[PDB]
């Protein structure tokens with residue numbers, strides 16, 4: 001645990017925790033490929049349980065990176081193609097607006113304005129079909145990016161259909177297990193509840209509630225140890241033994257679309273490194289519709305990139321960022337949803353300092 005790392009981490013995180021009034025937090029810094037952990041505060045204020053390297057946090061939208069990689073793996077296995085129309089894996093979507101909408105559009109939020117959230121009233125599989133059949137796109141496919149859980153969420157569900165596995169089974173078997181993410185869950189088992197931190201919203205302890213396409217869009221819970229391991233896997237996919245998974249991780253980091261200085265991958269988002277934090281630039285804007293330029297054909301993962309993803313649930317705030325070229329990365333998990341810009345600022349300050 002190099003004093004340089006200790007020092008920048010503490011000098012950056014302490015002020016952050018105090019300004020944002022965050023109950024508990026865990027940070028991991030990947031340096032020259034090795035992880036270093038830090039923890040503060042409480043996982044459960046009422047029961048005075050401290051945050052540890054085994055505390056599980058709700059990852060929120062950071063879960064989409066797992067989804068993008070599982071999708072990438074399915075492509076590598078020849079089970080699906082990003083150029084395939086959505087209807088190929090859901091024949092019941094007969095509504096004409098779906099014609100030129102492909103799995104690529106779904107995965108990158110470019111289908112034409114799919115909504116940010118699947119409505120609460122959508123429960124059953126039947127309800128989901130009705131929702132997508134009735135949705136009227138605001139734009140032609142491939143012209144604008146509008147971040148949406150209902151978009152990559154459908155991608156995840158369809159991507160695992162030829163496999164015959166449930167999304168959760170495919171994820172556990174093809175991603176979690178092979179990477180030894182043995183304390184990463186879509187559904188927390190009773191035996192692990194002891195380590196599940198509570199999120200805090202306006203002072204109340206809360207956990208994410210069930211929702212349609214939740215697993216695919218924002219339902220993963222994980223530890224700071226497994227997330228550091230997830231970052232390492234994405235920093236150096238070449239060390240991964242499972243071939244389709246290695247390929248899948250690389251596909252998730254390809255640049256499919258460009259908007260401003262940002263590039264859209266599968267789950268992950270990227271910017272060329274070096275980059276100043278002002279450029280990242282990625283926050284909320286309850287919704288920002290942005291025109292996109294197609295990258296034809298997509299650029300393979302660029303090593304000199306700042307690769308990242310933010311995430312939140314009602315009671316948790318998370319962030320992951322890494323730079324392949326420098327074998328550097330960071331994971332910040334907190335049980336309070338706080339401003340995205342404060343996350344990016346903290347991470348940048350730490351990584352820029354270390355390399």
Ligand SMILES: *C(=O)[C@@H](NC(=O)/C(=N\OC(C)(C)C(=O)O)c1csc(N)n1)[C@@H]1N=C(C(=O)O)C(=C)CS1
Pocket residue numbers: 059060061062116147149208209218283284285286310311312313314315340
């Ligand atoms: C990923 O983290 C996504 N978050 C959600 O879907 C949820 N909340 O997002 C916001 C918009 C911040 C909210 O408070 O409503 C959510 C899931 S389960 C639950 N209780 N809440 C997307 N993330 C962001 C972000 O920048 O945090 C978005 C702007 C779009 S939704």
